[PDB]
Design a protein around this ligand. Structure first.
Ligand code: CDL
Ligand code: T7X
Ligand code: 3PE
Ligand code: 3PE
Ligand code: 3PE
Ligand code: 3PE
Ligand code: PLC
Ligand code: PLC
Ligand code: SF4
Lengths: 128, 89, 184, 340, 171, 177, 86, 86, 60, 233
């Protein structure tokens, strides 16, 4: 029971109280037309999941290794003086290795969504 | 060490007797690793020894990379079939 | 206080059992992912209780902030079929589940003992009826915490491990690109 | 116990009312930039506007669409608001003057921050619309992408300090604010904070999407209040991160000479005055950053999704890795590795 | 040793020391006065501290019970120096540790009081403050004028006493 | 069973002539005042910006009149809106769309008809493709005349709706029941 | 000119944060018995503050600079009894 | 290797027993190695406190089987607030 | 750091004094509980002769 | 097989302007097929005009492009004048040209500021709508209406200019140049504006001609055609 724990308990309580007040005071009159999803005033057909681009997958997947790379530097910044010059060299080597992977990602154009349709540039030729 | 051991055993049983979906298999893998790390960290505290905590940190990093690769494999598997069956493997 | 605060560890254990069961029994696999997030919060609670709040924060940062986010991202983008838990599908496992539960739990408690006799091996597992005596000394003049010590050993005594881990992360980049991107 | 309760009530009231008045300040400031007035009618000088909006929304019916996981749609905004407010527990308004004086305060900030993407992620799943899922996916991708940038800048700062205690990080800036040697990092941190709060010009999801108004399109009543409050609370909290990491937190100027003239011994009067000076310094920095959020909203058009992903991963992140290299190199060259 | 974890209770032992062990006084200063006196204690009691630590190392595991007489010497020397400070330089010593109590126990926040304390202790106790391990090129920080790092509020009583000493000529 | 008679009064005043007297009356009046004050001060319309009338609506938000000085904010989503403003000709092809948007508004809800087209069909009243007044499709609280109504006329209509809001019985109405 | 009505909400925010911080500083000092807070305290500081509690009679952060300890200091030593971390 | 390093970068809880056992193994050979059995025993004891737990079980069994009073300087448990009171 | 170094010996001497006092006290208490039984309370569980303050108390 | 995903962009949508039902088909990110459904504002104007006298039909033209009212009036008036074989007097012709260019300014304020608002530049809209307010005062002072003036009619204009109007138009003109400069300061060199506009919606000159595009939609492709210079009225 310091201020930290009391504050952390108190926040969800206030959220729940506001929710309870809204439930207690607002009217509640569901009916079929009101219950429809709002899509610009019309109705759309249910569809198979959209086909998505690979860059959408790749941003989320590549977040994890880069995030781990960044978070692995926390022990270094918390120990920099103790490990001073030896650890400075080691952390440089570690960073350079990860930068090679960044280079691979950049040169492969891995997060670029390519507009499939492009203007036609073929010449017009006539067989006389 | 009780909580880690129970988590590991129950996660393993959930993985094995999973007959519902493939995401449960992914989750059971992640939570088995969590249970192992919990056991290790308790022993690290009781010995006042940094080796256990060092191994636990490495385990966390490897679990991240393993998650990334496993989900890449799942997406590549999805690319040809467009769906995951409740036996999707 | 005392009654609740003495059994905080036991409460985390009970909640963990319940959370695992809820992970396996969830109808919607997204709900299963949410119960996995709950289990990780419980694990962070346990780690704080045993003195490792830094690992609590790291687990929240990495397993919830990154791994669970990727889990949800994937289940949102992908078309997953799942069946519900039912007697017709799953009561056939109950005998094997029971035998495996007993055998694996007992063996996982016995692997820790050094007694020759098997029953003593299992008995030592439930043998902490005593309190540890915490004592002070004055030999540590520096402000060295767990994170600092981890940095110290990882960057000097075990630098090779850090560089190999760099290679592993390189794999975590190159591989996903190799099998999720179609070149040319 | 009593003192603890009083302190928590004071801090909580100040934060919640600051959030309420930030919305009024945004409306007024945008208005005067656009040669109009903004709210000047609900309350004197329009000072009750936010409270009118809050009461109106608290009396508005909650709608649960038919294909909707109603529990998930009512709890997702609640958890985003809860994490957003929990972030305030470590912000100090003077040396050690905080609700939570944590030696792991920076780590707490980052972890609670990384819990901030789940609202966008869960809101789309709340319904059964593919428009919603795609929009939530994009917003989540933007959020984690700029999370990387913010975390990198945090680590770059800790390279100068070697501490995760926020008070200590502020205290080391009595020699110089860290925005002076690292001014490009001030620019980058502000840009990334605007992106991380999904504010204009980084507001794809709400303003160019399939659903008319982001993934809050389906929210009415108190859930809408939760999302709105969480957004503005995160604006102020991420600005407080900016303030203590780069702007010297509660530091303004050396008032030792003035205090020695004014007072001859320690008293509650001198303590109150020092507390006021420190808190006013931090508050005025927060005011400038909030004004900057609004000003940037006033001046610019929106990015597209492709543009912003490119900005994060091809322009900003490579610079931040180069900075990862150059900062420890400068500390090594001049033998200035910080002690613990 | 690690700090205590999840649930712990403090317990006091009511027994007396075994009567074979010669009794000794205990140091009665708290953390701020001790930090204020630490350099003078080091200066005077270095041989006894070194002997105590060497005994502990040589005992190779039984150090607590084998170095009790050396520890008795260490504690008596510390009590003697603090008594001397309380007899000759109490006002300045109190200035210094009250300043420390206001400044998070940071010596950089209390340089004015420390200057008076050092002059008093040197003139009436012949102890000198000195930082081990520096080269002649390196300057001890407590002797530095115009430091980068300064306190938020220079201590009121200490500022007045420092100015007065500069008038008198003591400092 | 038991109750067999009545003591109901015979000249109990009607809601438009009843005035507070009993301090429960005064409590409920204060509560209604707070609720109606919030409804007036946070006036969020969904725009059905059909035609030229919408231009005048745009000018209400422009600097000369600056609608948001009164607390008015236009919302894309009907889920976040209290007021529907029908501003333009309503065609037969559009009528189900308008009804659908109106039905998705959470309660309480009000509708303003703006301009002759929305009011009764206007210049296109005798057309084969035009609904003759949006009150064939949705209930209407206020009608604003003009083709188009000026910005000031639309603001006047908004003030009329706010007057209606300010005079609504909510807890006093429940107390009457 | 400077639009003052547009500055009124910023002034409210600035005043709220300023007053809340000043009140918090006063409450912290009052909780400490007239001195500023300790911050960034390591295990050494924690043990020193426990020893201070043993010397000053449980009076929080009160300091005593007398060379010799009282008699009760010999017998109010505390060891902690930690429950088994299962 | 991080063997021997505690959570604070010093020597771990059982370092002394381990170092004495390593001295033993370094001085002996494979044929003589069993001469080092006590050292290793001590090491394992420090790690797991098995004999200590057994001895405490014995003492506690005899304690709970006694109705006669105990007359020795006792142990007293106090609240953390009451460290140094009176 | 040098200030803490100069304070280390007196603090550790006080703590060592307490360690001895309480260890001998606990030995006396345990031998009084075990009076009348055939058990040696003075026999260490270790094989070296070194002083070993107890870990592991009976819960109070 | 590529499977399109189909979205109704509009009608109740900010960009779709309330009345456009743009049915789009996307394969991931990209539009593969687009189908604009219209007629949500089909009023049957052309049927109604057949039951009106020419004078009675004039106000229908105000309500076609309802930010460009007077130029709509002008095209109907010029057609009827050509069929009537009459000549507008000189002052009437000058008033029609002057108010045609005022109408062009009003239209371009609406279009450019709405375009900027759609991309997300919210401020040019407010700044430009104040200028629109100033010009609509001129509309109202000559015709008695802010929008649907019915001012330009077959034969000329319905009333003469009031006494102080030329002076007021001149004073508005002395500052409109600065008003334009500030919008250009926000947009013309902004790199985000260029990211949203450069190489977006490209049309070749030949395709522009083949599709029936006119005005800027044509002049942007490099073809110098403008009816004011090619066939002066
Ligand atoms: C700082 C912002 C001001 C910077 C520029 C000032 C320009 C100006 O004063 O002339 C207006 C002038 C308009 O000409 P005018 O209207 O014909 O004549 C002016 C009136 O006669 C005279 O108009 P005036 O009476 O407003 O000017 C006098 C003014 C000051 O006169 C000065 O210019 C002094 C020099 C600048 C110091 C500003 C002091 C006040 C600062 C505002 C905060 C108050 C605290 O003193 C005041 O009245 C202050 C306002 C009253 C208190 C406001 C209520 C406080 C609420 C709480 C706020 C707390 C959060 C902050 O515009 C310009 O000259 C160009 C302005 C363009 C500024 C470019 C950017 C400047 C640098 C960036 C600033 C970023 C913000
Ligand atoms: C000063 C004021 C504080 C400032 C701002 C806070 C809000 C102040 C406004 C206070 C009151 C105005 C709002 C009151 C209000 O609209 O409910 C009206 C009734 O009306 C009364 O007669 C029901 C009695 C109303 C009780 C008033 C309590 C006031 C303090 C609330 C805490 C409409 O609900 P209603 O009849 O459909 O009744 C219920 C209700 O909405 C739900 O809880 C039920 O679950 C549902 O079945 C539904 O039928
Ligand atoms: C902190 C404040 C917490 C307040 C929460 C209280 C909830 C009360 C609302 C309620 O009665 O249940 C509403 C819930 C709506 O779901 P349902 O009606 O079944 O389906 C609608 C789909 N169009 O209906 C349900 O299915 C109930 C779901 C929750 C079960 C709680 C049971 C509450 C019983 C009230 C007594
Ligand atoms: C107890 C296990 C965990 C132990 C402690 C919790 C650890 C911390 C949790 C962190 C919070 C984030 C994760 C929460 C887990 C999510 C729970 C969940 O799965 O909810 C979704 C699920 C919907 O499933 P549904 O289809 O409605 O089942 C109907 C069956 N007839 O709904 C359900 O399955 C049941 C309804 C759940 C209601 C959750 C209410 C709490 C919301 C979180 C509040 C967090 C604290 C604030 C001081
Ligand atoms: C629990 C969930 C995850 C825990 C998050 C860990 C956050 C953290 O870092 O806690 C640290 C803080 C004490 O740490 P410290 O900075 O050393 O305090 C010294 C102040 N002079 O901790 C605190 O100040 C208060 C304790 C917060 C965590 C208590 C939660 C109880 C967990 C048991 C749940 C029972 C079931
Ligand atoms: C966008 C927001 C950018 C705003 C940044 C404003 C920066 C001005 C304050 C810098 C504060 C700092 O870190 O050092 C200030 C410090 C004050 O000195 P003093 O109060 O006497 O205390 C002496 C103990 N060092 O020591 C100094 O006075 C050093 C001189 C001030 C720092 C350099 C200022 C010149 C460059 C300013 C550029 C700021 C960004 C543009
Ligand atoms: C910080 C708070 C500063 C703002 C308070 C002044 C506004 C005011 O008191 O305004 C007067 C209000 C009603 O406001 P109004 O009906 O809109 O009249 C304004 C006249 N106009 C329309 C011409 C502008 O009277 C009251 O009931 C005040 C009780 C409100 C208490 C809640 C305060 C929240 C804290
Ligand atoms: C902690 C405080 C803030 C958080 C609480 C929630 C916000 C509450 C806002 C109340 C302010 C208000 O309601 O203003 C007061 C309203 C004004 O009504 P009106 O002027 O007739 O409306 C006019 C609408 N026009 C302008 C369009 C015509 O009612 C009253 O005068 C009755 C007295 C109410 C006293 C409540 C005091 C609350 C403390
Ligand atoms: S009423 Fe007049 S101005 Fe309004 S939409 Fe109809 S024709 Fe246009």
């Amino acid at each position: 029971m310091n201020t930290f724990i009391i504050f952390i308990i108190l926040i969800p309580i206030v959220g729940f109280a506001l929710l309870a007040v809204n439930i207690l005071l607002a009217v509640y009159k569901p009916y079929n037309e009101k219950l429809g999803a709002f899509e610009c005033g019309l109705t759309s057909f249910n569809q198979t999941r959209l086909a998505f681009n690979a860059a959408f997958i790749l941003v989320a997947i590549l977040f994890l290794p880069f995030d781990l790379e960044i978070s692995t530097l926390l022990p270094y910044v918390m120990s920099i003086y103790l490990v001073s010059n030896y650890g400075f060299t080691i952390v440089l080597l570690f960073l350079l290795i990860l930068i090679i992977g960044f280079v691979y990602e950049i040169n492969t154009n891995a997060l670029k969504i390519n507009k499939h349709n492009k203007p036609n540039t073929d010449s017009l030729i006539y067989k006389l | 060490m009780f909580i880690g051991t129970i988590i590991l055993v129950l996660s393993f049983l959930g993985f094995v007797f999973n007959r519902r979906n493939i995401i449960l298999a992914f989750i059971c893998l992640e939570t088995m690793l969590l249970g192992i790390n919990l056991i290790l960290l308790r022993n690290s505290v009781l010995f006042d020894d940094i080796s256990g905590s060092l191994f636990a940190i490495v385990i966390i990093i490897l679990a991240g990379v393993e998650s990334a690769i496993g989900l890449s494999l799942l997406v590549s598997y999805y690319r040809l079939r467009g769906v995951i069956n409740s036996y999707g493997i | 206080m005392m009654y609740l605060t003495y059994y905080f560890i036991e409460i985390t254990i009970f909640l963990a059992i319940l959370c695992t069961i809820f992970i396996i029994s969830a109808k919607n696999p997204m709900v299963s992912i949410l119960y996995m997030i709950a289990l990780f919060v419980i694990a962070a609670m346990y780690l704080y209780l045993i003195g490792l709040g830094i690992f609590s924060l790291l687990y929240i940062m990495i397993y919830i902030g990154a791994i669970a986010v990727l889990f949800l991202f994937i289940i949102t983008l992908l078309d997953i079929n799942s069946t519900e838990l039912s007697v017709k599908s799953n009561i056939r496992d109950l005998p094997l589940v029971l035998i495996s539960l007993i055998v694996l739990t007992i063996s996982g408690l016995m692997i820790y003992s050094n007694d020759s006799i098997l029953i003593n091996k299992l008995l030592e597992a439930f043998g902490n009826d005593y309190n540890t005596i915490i004592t002070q000394d004055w030999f540590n003049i520096e402000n060295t915490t767990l994170l600092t010590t981890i940095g110290n050993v990882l960057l000097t005594n075990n630098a090779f491990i850090l560089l190999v881990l760099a290679i592993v992360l390189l794999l975590g980049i190159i591989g996903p690109i190799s099998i999720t991107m179609k070149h040319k | 116990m009593i003192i603890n309760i009083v302190e928590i009530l004071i801090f909580l009231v100040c934060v919640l009312f600051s959030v309420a008045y930030l919305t009024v300040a945004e409306r007024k400031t945008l208005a005067y930039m656009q040669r109009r007035l903004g709210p000047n009618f609900v309350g004197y000088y329009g000072l009750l506007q936010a409270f009118a909006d809050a009461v109106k929304l608290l009396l508005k019916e909650i709608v649960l669409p038919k294909e909707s996981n109603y529990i998930i749609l009512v709890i997702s905004p609640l958890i985003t608001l809860i994490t957003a407010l929990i972030g305030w527990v470590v912000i100090p308004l003077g040396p050690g003057i905080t609700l939570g004086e944590l030696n792991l305060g920076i780590l707490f900030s980052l972890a609670i921050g990384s819990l901030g993407v789940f609202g966008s992620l869960l809101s789309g799943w709340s319904s059964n619309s593919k428009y919603s899922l795609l929009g939530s996916i994009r917003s989540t991708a933007q959020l984690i992408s700029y999370e990387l940038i913010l975390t990198s800048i945090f680590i770059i700062i800790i390279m100068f300090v070697s501490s995760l205690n926020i008070t200590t990080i502020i205290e080391t800036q009595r020699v110089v604010w860290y925005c002076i040697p690292l001014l490009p990092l001030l620019l980058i941190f502000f840009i990334a904070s605007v992106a991380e709060t999904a504010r204009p010009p980084f507001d794809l999801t709400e303003s160019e999407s399939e659903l008319v108004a982001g993934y809050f399109t389906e929210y009415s009543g108190s859930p809408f209040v939760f999302f709105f409050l969480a957004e503005y609370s995160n604006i102020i909290l991420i600005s407080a991160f900016n303030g203590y990491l780069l702007l010297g937190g509660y530091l303004s100027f050396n008032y030792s000479y003035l205090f020695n003239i004014l007072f001859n011994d320690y008293s509650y009067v001198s303590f109150l005055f020092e507390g006021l000076i420190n808190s006013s310094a931090y508050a005025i920095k927060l005011v400038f950053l909030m004004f900057s959020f609004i000003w940037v909203r006033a001046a610019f058009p929106r990015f597209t999704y492709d543009n912003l992903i490119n900005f994060c991963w091809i322009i900003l992140l490579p610079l931040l890795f180069g900075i990862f290299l150059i900062i420890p190199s400068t500390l090594y060259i001049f033998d200035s590795f910080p002690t613990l | 040793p690690r700090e205590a974890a999840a649930h712990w209770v403090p317990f006091e032992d009511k027994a007396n020391m075994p009567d074979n062990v010669p009794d000794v006084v205990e140091v009665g200063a708290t953390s701020a006065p001790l930090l204020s006196a630490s350099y003078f204690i080091g200066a005077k009691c270095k041989p006894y501290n070194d002997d105590f630590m060497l005994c502990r190392e040589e005992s190779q595991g039984s150090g607590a019970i084998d170095c009790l007489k050396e520890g008795r010497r260490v504690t008596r020397c510390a009590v003697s120096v603090i008594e001397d400070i309380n007899k000759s330089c109490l006002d300045e010593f109190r200035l210094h540790w009250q300043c420390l109590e206001q400044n998070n126990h940071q010596l950089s926040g209390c340089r004015k009081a420390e200057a008076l304390l050092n002059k008093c202790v040197f003139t009436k106790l012949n102890l000198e403050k000195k930082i081990p391990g520096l080269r002649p090129d390196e300057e001890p920080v407590f002797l530095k004028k115009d430091p980068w790092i300064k306190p938020a509020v220079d201590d009121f009583k200490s500022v007045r006493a420092y100015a007065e000493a500069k008038k008198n000529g003591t400092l | 069973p038991r109750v067999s008679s009545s003591s109901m009064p015979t000249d109990f005043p009607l809601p438009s002539q009843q005035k507070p007297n009993s301090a429960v009356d005064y409590t409920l009046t204060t509560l209604d005042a707070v609720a109606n004050w919030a409804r007036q001060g946070s006036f969020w319309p969904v725009t059905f910006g059909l035609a030229c009338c919408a231009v005048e609506m745009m000018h209400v938000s422009a600097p000369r009149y600056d609608q948001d000085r009164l607390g008015i904010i236009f919302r894309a989503s009907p889920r976040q809106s209290d007021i529907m403003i029908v501003a333009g000709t309503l065609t037969n092809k559009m009528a189900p769309v308008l009804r659908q948007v109106y039905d998705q508004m959470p309660e309480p809800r009000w509708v303003i008809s703006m301009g002759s087209c929305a009011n009764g069909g206007g210049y296109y009243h005798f057309s084969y493709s035009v609904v003759r007044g949006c009150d064939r499709i949705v209930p209407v609280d206020v009608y604003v005349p003009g083709c188009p109504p000026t910005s000031e006329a639309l603001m006047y209509g908004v003030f009329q709706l706010q007057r209606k809001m300010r005079n609504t019985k909510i807890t006093r109405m429940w107390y009457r029941k | 000119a400077i639009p003052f009505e547009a500055l009124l909400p910023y002034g409210i925010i600035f005043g709220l944060l300023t007053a809340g911080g000043g009140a918090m500083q006063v409450l912290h000092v009052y909780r400490n018995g007239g001195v500023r807070d300790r911050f960034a305290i390591d295990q050494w500081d924690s043990q020193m503050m426990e020893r201070d509690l043993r010397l000053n009679g449980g009076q929080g952060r009160k300091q005593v600079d007398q060379a010799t300890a009282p008699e009760a200091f010999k017998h109010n030593h505390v060891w902690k009894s930690e429950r088994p971390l299962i | 290797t991080a063997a021997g390093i505690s959570l604070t970068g010093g020597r771990n809880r059982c370092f002394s027993e381990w170092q004495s056992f390593m001295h033993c193994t370094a001085k002996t050979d494979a044929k003589s190695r069993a001469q080092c059995l006590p050292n290793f025993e001590d090491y394992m004891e420090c790690l797991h406190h098995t004999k200590e737990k057994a001895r405490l079980r014995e003492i506690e069994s005899v304690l709970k089987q006694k109705k006669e009073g105990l007359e020795a300087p006792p142990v007293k448990v106090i609240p953390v607030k009451a460290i140094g009171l009176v | 750091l040098w200030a803490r170094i100069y304070l280390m010996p007196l603090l550790q001497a006080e703590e060592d004094r307490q360690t001895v006092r309480r260890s001998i006290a606990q030995l006396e208490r345990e031998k009084e509980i075990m009076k009348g039984t055939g058990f040696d309370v003075d026999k260490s569980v270790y094989n070296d002769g070194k002083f070993h303050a107890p870990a592991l108390m009976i819960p109070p | 097989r590529i499977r399109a995903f189909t979205i109704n962009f509009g009608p109740q949508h900010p960009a779709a302007h309330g009345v456009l039902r743009l049915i789009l088909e996307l394969s991931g990110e990209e539009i593969i097929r687009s189908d604009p459904h219209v007629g949500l504002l089909h009023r049957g104007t052309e049927k109604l005009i057949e039951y009106k006298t020419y004078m009675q039909a004039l106000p229908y033209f105000d309500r076609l492009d309802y930010v460009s009212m007077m130029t709509n009036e002008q095209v109907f008036s010029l057609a009827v004048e050509k069929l009537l074989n009459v000549e507008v007097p000189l002052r009437g012709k000058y008033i029609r040209t002057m108010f045609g260019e005022i109408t062009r300014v009003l239209n371009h304020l609406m279009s450019v500021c709405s375009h900027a608002m759609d991309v997300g530049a919210l401020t040019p809209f407010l700044w430009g709508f104040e200028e629109r307010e100033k010009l609509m005062e001129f509309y109202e002072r000559v015709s008695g209406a802010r929008l649907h003036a019915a001012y330009v009619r077959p034969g000329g204009v319905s009333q003469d200019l009031p006494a102080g109007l030329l002076d007021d138009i001149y004073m508005w003109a002395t500052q409109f140049g600065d008003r334009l400069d500030e919008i250009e300061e926000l947009l013309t060199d902004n790199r985000i504006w260029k990211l949203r506009t450069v190489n977006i919606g490209t049309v070749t000159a030949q395709d522009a001609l083949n599709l029936g595009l006119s005005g800027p939609m044509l002049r942007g492709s490099g073809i110098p055609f403008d009816i004011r210079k090619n066939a002066p009225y």
